[PDB]
């Protein structure tokens, strides 16, 4: 595998505004109508989160400072997963979360991630809903321990919060329909945990995995026609702050302050 695409496209970064977003349940204890104050890693309100586009193939190795907030508009399922790690190379144990069509596979291996990792996606003519995914993520995967498979994590805005504390990798999500044209919605929505993986590795950088179609084939290029659908994903950073987290009568977080 390991085909590299991004020759020279170096358009300067663009920042949108995560109005009031990336607020999760920092507890597994049900709370009735009460304003609760929590001190944990939250995405600050009205913070400039980067605005990446899938159509420039935008697979940059981004820092995992203290935990990231990941949100993707993604009208069609193209944002497929992540490659959290410290070096994203051998000699360093790394994490991989990807979901194919009906299940997510989470692996923590000594990956040899490609320079431009992604997935090729094809629709076989026998069933135009098959979406056969080919892995162009890593060249070698060996000498590892963890493996987790469950239902898939994923214009259908989809928000995530990955934070790596004391050996547990914690994932939160809230997949909600979106009609807004370009940027994050203004309404408040509280992410709720997906899994709590006993990973226990060192994570400092991370990179997203796109699902690119092979539109055309020049004979020898391998980098010819990898069109990238149309989507945009939004990477913010968690910081240690103290929210006052309001719970509904039904136990849901309907509003918060910073």
């Amino acid at each position, epitope marked *: *595998q390991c085909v590299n695409l991004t020759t020279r496209t170096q358009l300067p970064p663009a920042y949108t505004n995560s109005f009031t977003r990336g607020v999760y349940y920092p507890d597994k204890v049900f709370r009735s109508s009460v304003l609760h104050s929590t001190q944990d890693l939250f995405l600050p309100f009205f913070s400039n989160v980067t605005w990446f586009h899938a159509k420039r193939f935008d697979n940059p190795v981004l820092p995992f400072n203290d935990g990231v907030y990941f949100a993707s508009t993604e009208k069609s399922n193209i944002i497929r997963g992540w490659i959290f790690g410290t070096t994203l190379d051998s000699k360093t144990q790394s994490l991989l979360i990807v979901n194919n069509a009906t299940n997510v596979v989470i692996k923590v291996c000594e990956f040899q991630f490609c320079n431009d990792p992604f997935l*090729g996606v094809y629709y*076989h003519k026998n069933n135009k809903s098959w979406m056969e995914s*080919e*892995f162009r993520v890593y*060249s070698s995967a060996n000498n590892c321990t963890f493996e987790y498979v469950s239902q898939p994590f994923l214009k259908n805005l989809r928000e995530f919060v990955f934070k790596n504390i004391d050996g547990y990798f914690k994932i939160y999500s809230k997949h909600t329909p979106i009609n807004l044209v370009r940027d994050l919605p203004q309404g408040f929505s509280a992410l709720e945990p997906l899994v709590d993986l006993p990973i226990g590795i060192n994570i400092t950088r991370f990179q997203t995995l796109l699902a690119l179609h092979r539109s055309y*084939l*020049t004979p*020898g290029d391998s980098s010819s026609g990898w069109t990238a659908g149309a989507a945009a994903y939004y990477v913010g950073y968690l910081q240690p702050r103290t929210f006052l987290l309001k719970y509904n009568e039904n136990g849901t977080i309907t509003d918060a302050v910073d």
Partner: antibody
Amino acid sequence: VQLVESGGGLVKPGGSLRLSCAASEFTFSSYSMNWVRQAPGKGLEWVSSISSSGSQIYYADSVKGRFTISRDNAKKSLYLQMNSLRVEDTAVYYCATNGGAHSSTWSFYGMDVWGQGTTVTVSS
Amino acid sequence: YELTQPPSVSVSPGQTATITCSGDKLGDKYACWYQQRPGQSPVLVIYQDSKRPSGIPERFSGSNSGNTATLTIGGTQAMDEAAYFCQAWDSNTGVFGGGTKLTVL
């Protein structure tokens, strides 16, 4: 990329050969590699295939158990061992890129890049 | 798995040629096509039953339906005199058609 074959030469039946197909560029790591042979006066015939990382290996029935394929992306090379050769294996052996990285994708591309094949004559 | 092709086809230059490839329910598979000039390496001219690689002229049109996938050469001329091999992948093992020579008068 460009492929150059080597290692094909005259041999008596039952011999052994190690075909080598060294790619021009290092993007050889991204192509599933295919061995296809053209009999001296007959049509084109598939022989073997290997995934891009080498984890998926498939052979034709007429060579299963006798040939073993491998690839070394570090040396950007493809290899074919011919164990227990027979006379009906004389051909010119092409190495052809596929483009799909795994066997589930081989059907979605074609053998787009072909190295100039090397002739293998298995006779007395 | 087996694919059948006519031994040869012949058309006048500038006409339309048609090389056919019949197989056991081939229309559910992707049939790629190759071109082999006499004594040269094959060149992929059609893949995925309709799509051409870059550099292959737009007059190379093919299709797949049912049990038969056909390749049609629009404006057949002198450089199209070569062997054409239908190809399909069954059980992760590729199969090549017989190879129908095309003669350009």
